[PDB]
Design a protein around this nucleic acid. Structure first.
Ligand SMILES: [Zn+2]
Ligand SMILES: [Zn+2]
Ligand SMILES: [Zn+2]
Ligand SMILES: [Zn+2]
Lengths: 72, 73
DNA sequence: CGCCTCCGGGAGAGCT
DNA sequence: AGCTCTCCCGGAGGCG
């Protein structure tokens, strides 16, 4: 069962308001809080799945917000 | 692995300075911050183990303080 | 990044 | 109507 609304990988539970895997949970916390510089080199449409997750952090962050993920 | 120095059930790790299970963890946090009104019907030496934890919160609370559990400020 | 261990705490069950 | 206890998630720090 257990599927992450962001990357399709196995979800470990509901994190920051959305059902996600472990890696997407910590990717998000780091994206908000830390020093980063993400820029899409595509059209802002990038496919986000387990194999291509690392390719476009900008699109990975975009999908997170659009699913309503947030901090405290 | 890992005993619980207070009730002996099974320890998940160290909580508030002492190696304890999860139920003692949350019992202690609540015993301090709450209106509690616990008192012993024994001689204040009651045995505290998994089967008897619920008998004497007063003594269970004393075992925590004797093991040095605290929060602070 | 992706994963781990460790500790704190909220909340909804369950038990008299 | 309180206590009690497991389940779940958040944050920090470490490591490959
Ligand atoms: Zn994911
Ligand atoms: Zn992109
Ligand atoms: Zn215990
Ligand atoms: Zn007693």
């Amino acid at each position: 069962q257990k599927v992450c609304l962001i990357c399709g990988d196995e979800a470990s539970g509901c994190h920051y308001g959305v059902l996600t895997c472990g890696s997407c949970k910590v990717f998000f916390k780091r994206a908000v809080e830390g020093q980063h510089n993400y820029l899409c080199a595509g059209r802002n449409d990038c496919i986000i799945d387990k194999i291509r997750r690392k390719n476009c952090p900008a699109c990975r962050l975009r999908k997170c917000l659009q699913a309503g993920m947030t901090l405290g």
